């Protein structure tokens, strides 16, 4: 029991899988089956579909193969007998772990060893669908350098935002729809106030209304907490204190629902001045650019961020909105806890000439920076 937590769970499943197929022996392809039986976008499954493998097909054909194997009476002992290939798979996974300089043998090490050693089933199967050891190893190293969740953002992703707010007793809802393109750090959204007129300025809601669409450069992909928590998602909580005015508190969940990334928010604002800059709608319709400092919150397995938003006021002054933010993963899976870095944000606000409702069209561009280590 000196494997990764996920790896030993796969190994622990073998007897059960052996019993399912009435097998005396447990073999390499049963371990493969177990690795692919994680389910919620599991690592083994991600590695292989990143290699071009139809993992639904693979599973079905493992089942077929196993059902056709010669029947053997099982031994009296609870523990199934280790097959020759699986024995070699486990030995070579110790070599692979040492070659990655890792602490314990993980799913990646076991998967690579199966592909390397199983000449009976796995290796010839991949050859049929034109995939070899080195193609899979590169997929492993790619995911090693980031997270599984990162793969969910490689193309254009639909976005839904739903917010229910209550500011000084004025209740409103906002719905946003659009798409995100993390490859280019870009998002494009249109928001409407579904309940009527927005009782606060649109720019005060911009920060509340999906940092998983930030572009993290190659040298920083080990520091992208937001994508790593996907698809299960994260909780994002804020306090936003408007200087010499009221305060917002927000709680949101950011997560995939089907193939849509959803940001669902509750907002409560109190102590606002009825003719202050916010309730009096005295803020310009624009949004300045900010550098937001991100740090790992080790005890909560998340990140935190405090930052100062500057809103242009129509009298030529600046209205500060001081933000306090904490994020925590919804899932139980491993997440990336980042070195200190920052997100550089730039935002353009506009109107849709065809839209008659109270609305905001938003375009943002976000890139991560702040890490400059010795080139590797």
**Domains along the chain with CATH numbers:** 1-147 (no CATH), 148-376 (2.40.155.10)
Handedness of CA 185, 189, 193, 198 (dihedral sign): positive
Obtained via which technique? X-ray
Residue listed under structure tokens 């499943």: 13
> How many CB atoms are located within 10 Å of the residue 78 CB?
8
Peptide bond into 231 cis (omega under 30): yes
Are 227 and 241 in contact by the 8 Å Cβ rule? The answer is: no
Q: Which structure tokens are listed for 71?
A: 């029947």
Residue listed under structure tokens 């073999």: 27
> How many CB atoms are located within 10 Å of the residue 274 CB?
8
Backbone phi, then psi, for 31, in 5-degree steps?
-65, -40
Q: Resolution to 1 decimal, in Å?
A: 2.0
> How many CB atoms are located within 10 Å of the residue 217 CB?
12
d(CA 122, CA 352): 54
d(CA 154, CA 319): 37
Please report the beta strands in 27-107, taking only residues with DSSP state E, as ranges in sequence order.
81-82
Radius of gyration of the chain (CA): 26
d(CA 150, CA 48): 15
Residue listed under structure tokens 């199983």: 118
d(CA 189, CA 174): 12
Closest CA to 328 of 234, 244, 265: 234
Closest CA to 70 of 33, 21, 34: 21
> How many CB atoms are located within 10 Å of the residue 242 CB?
23
Q: Which structure tokens are listed for 162?
A: 């739903």
Contacting residues for 41 by C-beta, under 8 A, at least 6 apart: 148, 149, 152, 231
């Amino acid at each position: 029991d000196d494997y990764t937590e996920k790896a030993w769970e796969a190994i622990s499943s073998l007897n059960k899988i052996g019993e399912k197929y009435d097998s005396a022996y447990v073999e390499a392809e049963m371990l493969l089956l177990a690795l692919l039986n994680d389910s919620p976008d599991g690592l083994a499954e991600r590695i292989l579909k990143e290699s071009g493998i139809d993992t639904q097909l693979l599973v079905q054909e493992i089942d077929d193969y196993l059902k056709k194997q010669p029947k053997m009476p099982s031994g009296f002992g609870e523990q199934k007998i280790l097959g020759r290939t699986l024995q070699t798979v486990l030995s070579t996974s110790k070599r692979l772990k040492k070659e990655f300089n890792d602490e314990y043998i993980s799913i990646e090490h076991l998967l690579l060893s199966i592909i390397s050693e199983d000449s009976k089933f796995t290796r010839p199967w991949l050859l049929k669908y034109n995939v070899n050891y080195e193609k899979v190893k590169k997929a492993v190293e790619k995911i090693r350098g980031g997270s599984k969740g990162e793969e969910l953002f490689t193309g254009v992703v639909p976005i839904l935002v739903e917010l229910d707010g209550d500011v000084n007793g004025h209740k409103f809802s906002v719905r946003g729809e659009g798409e995100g393109d993390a490859t280019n750090g870009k998002l494009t959204l249109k928001f409407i106030c579904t309940t009527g007129k927005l009782p606060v300025p649109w720019p005060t809601l911009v920060t509340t209304l999906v940092q998983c669409f930030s572009r993290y450069p190659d040298h920083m992909k080990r520091h992208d907490f937001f994508k790593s928590a996907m698809p299960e998602g994260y909780v994002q909580e804020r306090t936003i204190s408007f200087k010499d005015d009221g305060t917002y508190k927000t709680r949101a969940e950011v997560k995939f629902e089907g193939d849509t990334l959803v940001n669902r928010i509750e907002l409560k604002g109190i102590d606002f001045k009825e003719d202050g800059n916010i309730l009096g709608h005295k803020l310009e319709y624009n949004f300045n650019s900010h550098n937001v400092y991100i740090t790992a919150d080790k005890q909560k397995n998340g990140i935190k961020a405090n930052f100062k938003i500057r809103h242009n006021v129509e009298d030529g002054s600046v209205q500060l909105a001081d933000h306090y933010q904490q994020n925590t993963p919804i899932g139980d899976g491993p997440v990336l806890l980042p070195d200190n870095h920052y997100l550089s944000t730039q935002s353009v606000l506009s109107k849709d000439p065809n839209e008659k409702r109270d609305h905001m069209v938003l375009l943002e561009f976000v890139t991560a920076a702040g890490i400059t280590l010795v080139p590797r």
